[PDB]
Each structure stands twice: as C-alpha cells, then as structure tokens.
Design an enzyme around this catalytic site. Structure first.
Site, PDB file in Angstrom:
ATOM      1  N   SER B 267      -2.647  -9.079  -7.514  1.00 45.48           N
ATOM      2  CA  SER B 267      -3.959  -9.262  -6.906  1.00 45.48           C
ATOM      3  C   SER B 267      -4.718 -10.413  -7.549  1.00 45.48           C
ATOM      4  O   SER B 267      -5.266 -11.274  -6.852  1.00 45.48           O
ATOM      5  CB  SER B 267      -4.759  -7.969  -7.003  1.00 45.48           C
ATOM      6  OG  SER B 267      -5.023  -7.646  -8.353  1.00 45.48           O
ATOM      7  N   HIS B 295      -0.394  -3.754  -2.794  1.00 42.45           N
ATOM      8  CA  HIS B 295      -1.099  -4.818  -2.094  1.00 42.45           C
ATOM      9  C   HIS B 295      -0.318  -5.415  -0.932  1.00 42.45           C
ATOM     10  O   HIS B 295      -0.910  -6.127  -0.116  1.00 42.45           O
ATOM     11  CB  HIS B 295      -1.461  -5.936  -3.071  1.00 42.45           C
ATOM     12  CG  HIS B 295      -2.647  -5.630  -3.925  1.00 42.45           C
ATOM     13  ND1 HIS B 295      -3.936  -5.661  -3.444  1.00 42.45           N
ATOM     14  CD2 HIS B 295      -2.740  -5.286  -5.229  1.00 42.45           C
ATOM     15  CE1 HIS B 295      -4.772  -5.348  -4.416  1.00 42.45           C
ATOM     16  NE2 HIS B 295      -4.072  -5.115  -5.510  1.00 42.45           N
ATOM     17  N   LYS B 327      -5.299   0.714  -0.254  1.00 41.05           N
ATOM     18  CA  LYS B 327      -5.590  -0.660   0.126  1.00 41.05           C
ATOM     19  C   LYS B 327      -5.612  -0.848   1.638  1.00 41.05           C
ATOM     20  O   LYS B 327      -6.663  -1.139   2.213  1.00 41.05           O
ATOM     21  CB  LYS B 327      -4.572  -1.603  -0.515  1.00 41.05           C
ATOM     22  CG  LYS B 327      -4.306  -1.323  -1.988  1.00 41.05           C
ATOM     23  CD  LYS B 327      -5.571  -1.446  -2.804  1.00 41.05           C
ATOM     24  CE  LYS B 327      -5.292  -1.631  -4.287  1.00 41.05           C
ATOM     25  NZ  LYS B 327      -4.361  -0.640  -4.866  1.00 41.05           N
TER      26      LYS B 327
END
Ligand SMILES: CCCCCCCC/C=C\CCCCCCCC(=O)O[C@@H](COC(=O)CCCCCCCCCCCCCCC)COP(=O)([O-])OCC[N+](C)(C)C
Lengths: 420, 492, 62, 153
Positions: B267, B295, B327
C-alpha cells in the site's frame, strides 16, 4: 559450484501440513440451521441451547436489532480503514464514553476482536526484562499476549496466594542482590476475574494487598465476569467491593454478555492512552463496524435500565449447580456463582482420547434428548497447562426452572447409562 | 519466468538539496525537543500530561521517557491530521466532524460545525461497495433481522452456522482454489495462522515491506526470519541458495521447511510483486509461498480475481492465498484459500477456530452479495463497470499527476498513488491545506518510513468520477505550487 | 506586490527550517539566535577581513 | 507516525546513518560550526580550531556513545534500551562504510587542527586527549562494556 548444485538438489522439504487422521472430533463441525439461541436446531435436531455464551439473552432482543438496523441504514456495514485513517465514527466515541461511564472509569478503548484485545494490551506495557506473575489457569489469549511480549513469565498455582508470596519473596531477594537492575524492572500480575477453564473466581483483596506490599501492578481479565457478577453487573470488583482504582487495567470482550463482536480495555487515561499508539491490533487493523457498536450501546442501555437480570441469572446458576450434584461418574468443577462451569470424569482412565469419546457419547445422547451441550476444546500441543476434558454447562436467564431441572435429570440418566 | 505484458514501475531518487534540507529540519526539531524536555523536567513549564496516582508514586515508572520523545516533540505538533472522526458512509464524499485545539493539539474540542462533501482519498473502498443504500444493504438488513447481530460461541463449538459454510464455498469458487476458510479479522488471520503452518526449525523469508500482521505472525512462531530487499529477486535467490546450502546456524542441519511471505500490492510503496519470478524461484528451490492479497483481491485483474489473474498465472502454484474483505468488498473479515488438506488442517489447528468467536451473520451476507455482484451471478453489469472504471481512474490520475512534475512511486496499474513530500513540516502543511480545500488525504512520517521519504497516499476508487478527479487534480496542482512539491527532474 | 512575495519567501523559510510547527516563542528564540550570528559575522568581517568583497558588491550594484 | 506502517524494520535508528545525503549534511554541519566559531572577533585562529575540535568531539560523544535507547517506541520489545547508538548501528556489524567514515573524520579534523594550532603543547594535549576520548569507544573490543558501572542502567 557443482557441489553447491547437488547440495541444492538433494534437499527435500517436509510437507506443509501433516497428514491428518480422520478420527479428529474437531474435524466434524456442528451445523446450526439458524440463529444460535433458545430452542435452536442443531444437526437437524431441535434442541434447547446449553452451549452458547449468551448469559443475558440480549442476542434476540428487538431493541438491539432495531438499534443495529438503524445504524446499518445510517452508515452501512464496513468502516474501510484503521482508526488513524478515516475509520473513526461518532458511534465509536459514543460507545467508548458509554463503557467508561458504565464501568466508572476515566477512559476505555475498543478493539474489533475479543482475542486481539488482551493479546495486544499485554505486550504494549510488558517489555523485555520485566517480570510477569501469571496464574497457571490462564486462557490462551493471555498466553499469546505473554508470548508476544518477551518478559520473564513466572507461573503460580491456581487461586493460591502462598505460591504468589513465595515467588514475590524470591524476586525481592534477587532485588536485594542488585539494586541497579531492580530500579528499572517492572513487575506485573495478570489474573482473570472468573476463569473460563476452571470456572473459579479469584481472591482480589489478597491480590491488592500483595500489590501494595510488593510494588507489582495488576492486570485483570473480565471476559466472563463483566456482565454476570455484582449487583449492577460491573465485574468481580463490584462483587468483592474492591475499588476499581486499585486495578490498573481491566480487559473484557463484548461477545459473551453484550452479544456483539469486539472487545475493550478500561482504566485511567494514563494507562489507556498508550494503547492508542502502541496496541498492534488497534493501530494496524480496521475498526469495528458501526452496527455492532450500536448493538453494544443498546445492550448497555438495557443493562443499565434494569439490574435484576443479574440476580435472576445468579439464582438460576445456583439451582442448576445444586441439581447437577450427585452424578455417579461425573463431577462438577466450578462455583455456584459461575454461569459457565464444567462436568469432568471422576475416574480418569489412561487415554485422553477415550475420555473425550465418553464425553462425546454423553453429549450426543443428550442432543438426541433435546439438550444441546458442548465439550471444551483446546489445542493440546500449544496450551501451557492443558485442562482435563470436560462438558461445558452454560446458564442463561431465558432458561426456565423446569427446563433446568429437565436438563439436570437428562444429563443424570445419560451419564449413568454411559458410565455403566 | 516471463511477463506477458510490460512491467512498468518508477522510483525516482531524492534530490540532494532536498535531503540536506530534510536533515536541517529534523535537527532543529530534535534540538528544540531536547530543550522542551529540559524545561518540563525542571517544572519551569507545566506539562499537559497525565501522571500516576499518589498511591503508586514509589512503584517503578511504567513508561520510559525517551521512548515517548517523538510522540511529544514531533507527533503532537501535527496530531490534527490523523484520527479525524467522520459521521457518514465513507463513499466518494464523506462528512468530517470539525474539531479545534487551543493548547497546540494536546486536547481537542468538537465545534458544532461539520464539514460536508469532502472528497475522500483515504478510505479503502476500491470498487465502491460502501453504500448505505443498495441491494447488499437490504440483504444484510434481512439477515440481521433473522439471525441477529453477532454470534456468542466458537466455530468448533455450537457457534458454527450455515451462513459460514455458504460463504466458504462461495469464496472457494471465487478464487479458483479447492477450499477456503473465513475468519473474523484480517490481522488475526495472519497472526493466528502463520504459527500453525510453521514452527521451530523452519525458515521464513520476509520482504522489507511486509505488513505488521505478517511480521507478528512470523515472530509468534519459532521459525528463523530473514529479510530480503523489496522486490529484489537477486536477494531472494541468494538467500534461498545460502539457506539450502549452509543450513541451520547453530548446527548445520537441513531446514524442515522454507516459507516465503509476500504481498500482492504494497500500500505505501505502491508496487506490485513480481509474481512470475517468485513462482519460478519457489519451484526451483522447493519453497512454499504465502501470498497476502488484501489490496489486490478486488482492485487488480481483468475480472478481479487478484494478482494471479492480473499476471495470468495459475492459482494452484500459490500454496497459501490469504485475503481480506475489508478493502474491496466493504465488510470486515479475512480468509485463507488453498488445498482441501490444508484447509482441513487449519479447521482443526487454527487458533481462531478454537478460541475466537466466529464472524457476524450480516457481515457474511454483505460479503456474499458483494462477491456475487462481482462475479456476475445476479446478471447485472455492475461487475464489469466497477473494475473498468477503477482501471480508467487509476491510469488517468497517475498520468496527469506525473505530467505536473510530482514524484510518484509504484507501478502504473496499482490504484494507490503515493506522492512524496520529503520534509517534516510539509507533512502537516499538506494535510491542513488539503483539508482546507475539501480533500481528505493520508500522510506518513519518519518512524513509519525511511527518514528522507515522507509521503501522502491517495486511494483511488470506482466511485470517483471524472469531475471529482479533475477537481482533485486542480487542487493538488495549486497546493503543489504553494508548497513547492514538484521535485521531478524528468518532467515539469 | 513585493509584500506578497516576501510573505511567500518567509513561508518557504518556515517550511524548510521546520519552524512552521514550532510555537511562537520558539520561533522568536531561533530568529534572535540567527540574527545575532549574522550580525557578529558581518562585524567580524568588517573589522578584520578586507572590504574587497564589499567593493565587488558595490561594483555589481553600479 | 507508528513504527512499521511503511517498512518492516524493528529499529529504523540502525539505518539513519546509511541514508542518502547524511554524510554531506554531517560535513556541512562541521563547516557551519567552524564558520560560527570564526564569527567571534576576539578569538584567535589556533584556538578557533581547538574549539572546533573540542565541540565536535563533545557533541559526537554525547550523541553516539552517551544517549542509549530509541526515541520512538519499537516493536522488537526493547532490544536496545541498554545499547547506545554506536552499538545499535547496523545491528552490531563491527565495520561498515558509515562506521569507517564516522571514525575516520575525527582523525582528519585532528590533523587539520594540529597543523593550524602551530603544534603548541597545550593545544596538542587537549586535542589529543579529546581524540582519545572519541576514538577509544570505537574499538570493536569495547562493545557493550561500561567502565566502573557508568551508564549501564
Ligand atoms: C543526555 C542528554 C543529552 C542532551 C543533549 C543536549 C542537546 C541540545 C542542546 O545542546 O541545546 C539545547 C539544550 O539542551 C538542554 O538543555 C537539554 C539537557 C538535557 C535534558 C534532559 C531532559 C530529561 C531529564 C537547547 O537548544 P536551543 O538553543 O533551543 O536550539
């Protein structure tokens, strides 16, 4: 280069997972065809719930569901970020304020998972070189918290203060040997208000006296005693009358009594404000979904509105504990005040597997007779002190007196038939 | 291994002048922090901190003062950028409650006014599933009314439900693996299942940028941990060679196992793991692979199966496939997918399976509806449009920021855009100025990152439209002119 | 117009020297120390060092 | 910010000396200290150089060898509360480009100040005792040893 090459070639790795024997009872999961509640259905068999940690019966309360639905309509399901990065809602702050006011304490911090609460709270304060005196019958969450920290761990006998004084006095001797190190070493005492493994309460006044005598701080786990003990149900501190200010940190989870996911720690601002920046489960994970926080707030409102439910639960626990006494091969382990206690085999045979099988036979025959029981599950190779196998009996304010008597009777005949 | 499509990534170097000025600033802050500590210790200036009770004054001090140095002297000054409360669904526009401090961020008081319509670049909803009104919300409401909120027991005990089995089979179909298991927390997934797979006598090879959950899970198990450089397959290959050859340090014996922990998208760095080369190395040296896809499970891929679909690889090559529903899917949770034998072993020997409470029913309903929408079982074209819009927004935002002269990290495909500020005061300045112009961003500092590299991360979404992105880009250009944040030599 | 430009330059000086985050009395302490050092440097240069650099600056100004 | 948000190192401190531009900043800092000293009117050039060497060595001793621990809370659970910064550097690897540079520069400053001090005896003994004070701890033999129990705890 070539000798390196076939050194690489000859090596062979062990398989990732060991070959699992199919005999494992934990391999087969009980499947509940609906909400786990009073008059549940398990494995297609209608049953009465005696295995779910739902003491106050707030799981099915229409007020809690209405509050959760309103918050779900207002916010949604997900928070989409940690508490640092746009993951703090107003409901989180409201819930923290409500918990602080309910427990009569300065500050509270909420985690989104019951295990992570204590497993992250303990390593935040206890570092390498410190000394931790932890009871032997400490749950796995406490053990993983103490392993995550690198402090020295000293175990003492369950609910035994002679062993605690002995260890403290040996520590005082080592203190006298070297004062320079003694001035920079911190001492902690980690205990649980109502032990889950044994169902026994702890001696707080003696612990407080030993704290003030030997300069060792106290950490308390109140997972089971948070919503069941005391006139107002504030924990074991209210039960003994001990001032809450003596206890440095009090941790619990919202899953058992409040019936929603999460956990919390309460204390003074001096100790609590450290976890906002050093609690790993807090800093590096998403926050609690808003609907669960609203359900917890509504459960707190209900618990504050009327305090008689704790007395009802206490009297039901007394009745069932008195009734279960007198089984032939099964002995009750726990106290009358405890809601969740154990039934173990009086005569223990050499093999643990066959003990587990016998208790499973009792559980299955009870399930066929409309009593839904469970058996305590442990990780045998991981636990520091593995308790004996047992059948867990849990009491809820919803279960009527006649149902309690029928459950005790049915367990009695099933146990006598099985042991015979 | 080879790449079917080009692999573009750029990590520009810090100009030397900016590095020198960075160190000037940090030195000034350190000196004034030492002065402030000296003033506070002699009680010449009153300290705005909570103190231990009088009854415990003779106990050993609970904290070490030097450890809190950076918190009081540097973090407190710019504390207002973080922990911003919100009072709305974290969509493309969010409502932030306003707070004011009169004692230099030591204490905050909430004024009545609330900021409305802030452009949201801090939340993690990649596919824009965070809606308070939708089909997913209605299904979640129905299951909340039926099952209630939360379960009060454990999976191995009476706490197992049918919804959990339905979710597990749906996840197994989604990823393409044989079996999968679901957990109630993404952090707990790693922290509680890495110890089960690997123990003492085995080796764990970790990246330089692994999440805190992966590092904690590695620490809890007794395995030896060795860290290779970020996306440097030379380092990984050398470590594998030396580990296989020399063996254990104390007594040179073969390792029982070798496990490689990696992530799909990092990230903060913004980079995507070089999966084909990692798979080639693990096949050559007979090492197992643990792939964290928090992610990348929703953002990446032509349809959205993750990094393995993005590269076009085979899911059967990855030994363990971790993932998180927070997420992309918009509901809290976690999962691990793999072979049926692995999943059964976890069902028996996972810490969270035995001791921790299982997931809430409305959350699993929300996950089920979102995942069915993504794979298109409902038949609505919302599945493809969200992914296509995310890709278009990512490419447009990254290109137009690179053509303004900023320094940006990571691949061209990753939907996280870390802009680089490089100076301690510019962190707070950027945060405050962006909030003043109705844009919410996330900024990080020295203890989190390398000292020279301080950044602000943008998380793009499929909910952001062209108008929103254009507004954000013009505001970013104005701020960058104001703070002089265009350090790019290649572009102006 | 010159006032706005000088304000921008002071803003950049604050951002670079990390004075943007320091409290006003800390800013004043740092500024006073800096101006004192600059004054002592110029005075010491005037007393001992030849004014050829000053002559060069004057020639450049002309 | 929290340690570990954007990197997996338990102790960022150990690498602050290997960062980009840190060496040039250190050199420019020494030069700025020297110029600030030259700014004093009554002080003479040889005693200017003596003061430069003394102040540099004092500050470097205070930072590298006196202050121990980490300014920020670290998730390794206190490896280095007892270790000083020099011991922390590079996880205890005894030689490194950073360590070599840090231990070489005081000797270069000593040679320069010996040249400019006109080789006087008083200045020689002051500068040499200061140089010994700095250079004695740098020896690999003196790693984690406290003489007469000073700064152990
Ligand atoms: C070991 C301690 C190392 C201290 C190094 C001091 C460096 C800072 C310094 O020289 O100038 C500082 C004094 O500095 C002080 O006056 C602070 C003195 C130590 C304070 C200790 C506080 C905890 C007790 C002041 O620096 P300034 O002029 O504000 O810039």
């Amino acid at each position: 280069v070539k000798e390196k090459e076939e050194l690489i070639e000859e090596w062979q790795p062990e398989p990732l997972v060991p070959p699992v024997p199919k005999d494992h009872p934990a391999l087969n999961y009980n499947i509940v065809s609906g909400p786990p509640s009073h008059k549940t259905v398990v494995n297609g068999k209608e049953c009465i719930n005696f295995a779910s940690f739902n003491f106050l019966g707030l799981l099915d309360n229409p007020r809690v569901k209405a509050a959760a639905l309103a918050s779900l309509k207002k916010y949604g399901v997900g928070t989409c970020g940690p508490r640092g990065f746009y993951g703090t809602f107003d409901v989180h702050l409201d819930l923290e304020d409500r918990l602080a006011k309910f427990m009569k304490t300065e500050e509270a911090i909420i985690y989104s998972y019951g295990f992570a609460t204590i497993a992250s709270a303990i390593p935040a304060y206890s570092k390498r070189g410190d000394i931790v005196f932890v009871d032997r019958a400490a749950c796995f969450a406490i053990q993983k918290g103490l392993q995550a920290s690198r402090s020295d761990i000293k175990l003492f006998k369950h609910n035994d203060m002679a062993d605690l004084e002995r260890l403290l006095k040996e520590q005082e001797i080592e203190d006298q040997k070297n004062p320079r190190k003694a001035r920079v070493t911190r001492r902690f005492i980690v205990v649980e208000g109502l032990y889950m493994n044994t169902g026994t309460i702890c001696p707080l006044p003696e612990l407080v006296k030993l704290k003030y005598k030997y300069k060792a701080r106290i950490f308390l786990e109140e997972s089971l005693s948070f919503g069941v003990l005391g006139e107002h149900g504030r924990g074991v501190t209210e039960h003994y009358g001990i001032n809450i200010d003596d206890i440095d940190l009090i941790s619990a989870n919202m899953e058992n009594a409040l019936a929603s996911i999460g956990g919390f720690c309460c204390g003074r601002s001096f100790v609590i404000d450290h976890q906002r920046l050093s609690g790993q489960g807090y800093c590096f994970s998403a926050s609690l979904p808003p609907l669960l926080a609203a359900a917890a707030i509504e459960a707190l409102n209900i618990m504050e509105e009327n305090p008689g439910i704790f007395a009802v639960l206490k009297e039901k626990c007394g009745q069932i504990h008195k009734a279960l006494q007198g089984i032939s091969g099964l002995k009750v382990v726990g106290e009358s005040l405890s809601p969740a206690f154990h039934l173990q085999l009086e005569e223990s045979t050499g093999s643990r597997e066959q003990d587990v099988r016998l208790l499973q036979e009792i559980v299955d025959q009870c399930m066929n007779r409309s009593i839904a029981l469970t058996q305590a599950r442990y990780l045998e190779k991981e636990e520091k002190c593995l308790p004996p196998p047992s059948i867990r009996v849990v009491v809820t304010v919803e279960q009527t007196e006649e149902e309690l008597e029928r459950a005790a009777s049915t367990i009695k005949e099933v146990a006598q038939a099985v042991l015979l | 291994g080879l790449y079917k499509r080009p692999f573009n990534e750029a990590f520009e170097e810090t100009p030397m002048l900016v590095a020198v000025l960075t160190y000037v600033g940090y030195g000034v802050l350190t000196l004034f922090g030492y002065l402030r500590d000296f003033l506070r210790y002699w009680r010449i200036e009153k300290c705005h901190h909570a103190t231990e009770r009088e009854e415990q004054k003779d106990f050993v001090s609970l904290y070490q003062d030097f450890e809190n140095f950076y918190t009081r002297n540097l973090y407190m000054r710019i504390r207002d950028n973080w922990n911003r409360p919100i009072c709305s669904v974290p969509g493309a526009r969010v409502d932030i409650m306003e707070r004011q401090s009169h004692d230099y961020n030591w204490s905050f008081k909430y004024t009545g006014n609330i900021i409305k319509g802030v452009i949201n670049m801090g939340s993690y909803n990649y596919l824009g599933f965070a809606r308070n009104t939708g089909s997913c919300q209605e299904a979640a409401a129905k299951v909340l009314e039926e099952y209630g909120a939360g379960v009060c027991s454990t999976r191995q005990e009476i706490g197992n439900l049918d919804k959990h089995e339905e979710l597990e089979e749906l996840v197994a179909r989604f990823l393409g693996v044989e079996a999968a298991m679901a957990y109630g927390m993404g952090f707990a997934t790693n922290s509680m299942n890495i110890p089960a797979l690997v123990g003492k006598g085995c080796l764990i090879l970790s990246d330089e940028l692994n999440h805190a959950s992966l590092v904690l899970g590695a620490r809890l198990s007794g395995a030896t941990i060795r860290i290779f450089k970020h996306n440097n397959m030379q380092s990984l290959e050398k470590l594998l060679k030396d580990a296989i050859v020399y063996g254990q340090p104390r007594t040179r014996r073969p390792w029982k196992k070798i496990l490689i922990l990696v992530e799909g998208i990092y990230s903060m760095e913004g980079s995507i793991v070089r999966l084909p080369e990692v798979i080639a190395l693990k096949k050559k040296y007979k090492a197992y692979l643990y792939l964290d896809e928090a992610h990348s499970i929703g953002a990446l891929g032509p349809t959205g199966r993750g990094v393995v679909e993005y590269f076009g690889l085979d899911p059967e090559d990855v030994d363990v496939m971790m993932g998180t529903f927070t997420k992309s899917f918009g509901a809290s949770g976690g999962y691990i997918g793999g072979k049926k034998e692995l999943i059964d072993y976890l069902r028996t020997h996972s810490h969270s399976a035995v001791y921790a409470t299982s997931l809430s029913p409305p959350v699993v309903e929300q996950i089920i509806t979102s995942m069915k929408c993504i794979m298109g079982q409902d038949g609505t074209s919302l599945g493809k449009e969200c992914v296509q819009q995310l890709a278009e927004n990512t490419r447009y935002f990254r290109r137009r920021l690179k053509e303004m002269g900023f320094i940006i990290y990571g691949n061209e495909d990753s939907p996280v855009v870390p802009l680089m500020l490089y100076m301690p005061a510019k962190i707070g300045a950027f945060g405050r100025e962006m909030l003043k112009r109705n844009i919410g961003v996330v900024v990080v500092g020295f203890p989190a990152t390398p000292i020279i590299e301080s950044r602000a991360r943008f998380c793009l979404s499929a909910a952001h439209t062209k108008e929103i992105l254009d507004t954000a880009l013009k505001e970013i250009d104005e701020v960058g002119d104001l703070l002089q944040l265009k350090y790019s030599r290649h572009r102006l | 117009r010159a006032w706005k430009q000088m304000s921008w330059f002071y803003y950049q000086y604050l951002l670079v020297t990390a004075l943007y985050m320091l409290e006003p009395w800390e800013r004043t302490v740092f500024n006073s120390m800096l101006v004192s050092i600059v004054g002592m440097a110029l005075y010491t240069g005037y007393v001992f060092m030849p004014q050829h650099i000053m002559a060069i600056l004057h020639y450049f100004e002309i | 910010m929290n340690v570990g948000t954007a990197h997996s190192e338990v102790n960022p401190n150990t690498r602050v000396m290997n960062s980009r531009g840190i060496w040039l900043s250190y050199v420019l800092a020494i030069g700025l200290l020297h110029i600030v000293l030259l700014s004093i009117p009554f002080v003479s050039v040889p005693v200017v150089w003596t003061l430069t060497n003394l102040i540099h060595n004092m500050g470097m001793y205070i930072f590298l060898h006196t202050v121990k621990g980490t300014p920020f809370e670290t998730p390794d659970q206190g490896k280095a509360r007892l270790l000083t910064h020099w011991e922390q550097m590079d996880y205890g690897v005894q030689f490194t480009a950073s360590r070599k540079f840090l231990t070489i520069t005081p000797i270069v400053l000593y040679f320069l100040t010996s040249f400019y001090t006109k080789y006087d005896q008083i200045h020689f003994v002051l500068n040499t005792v200061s140089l010994m004070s700095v250079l004695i701890p740098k020896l690999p033999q003196l790693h984690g040893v406290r003489i007469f129990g000073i700064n152990k705890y």
